[PDB]
Each structure stands twice: as C-alpha cells, then as structure tokens.
UniProtKB/Swiss-Prot annotation:
CDD domains: Antifreeze_III (cd11617). GO terms for cellular component: extracellular region. The keyword Secreted applies. Gene3D superfamilies: Antifreeze-like/N-acetylneuraminic acid synthase C-terminal domain. Belongs to the type-III AFP family. Keywords: Antifreeze protein, Secreted. PROSITE patterns: AFP_LIKE (PS50844). Disulfide bonds: none annotated. This is Type-3 ice-structuring protein HPLC 12. It comes from Zoarces americanus (Ocean pout). Residues 5-64 form the AFP-like domain.
Amino acid sequence: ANQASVVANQLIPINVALTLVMMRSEVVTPVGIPAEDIPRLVSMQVNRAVPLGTTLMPDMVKGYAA
C-alpha cells in the first residue's frame, strides 16, 4: 500500500513513555499503528521493549485503542 505505520526510531525500553523522537513513519509489512496517530501516542507507555526499526503494534501500547 501507500499505508505507512509507526516504526521505532530508537530502542524504546520497557515501560517508557513514548516521545516524538522515538517514532518515525514507514511503509512496512505487517501494518501496525497508522502513522497518522503519532500525535496521540505521546506520553503513553509501551508494555515491552521495542528495538530500533520495530513496527509498533496496538498491543504494545498501554491504554491504546484504535
């Protein structure tokens, strides 16, 4: 697609709260959280360590729903 997802721009350690420096937008498969949502992800925590280049999936963010 042209559908870009949120991809970790650095290793996001477990339980850290997401900041804008941590999140880039890329056309990756499988599709994860839509890149349009990078605004509303700031301050939410991840529930596991996300390595650099990992697509952020809905189940990795605490309190995220669609």
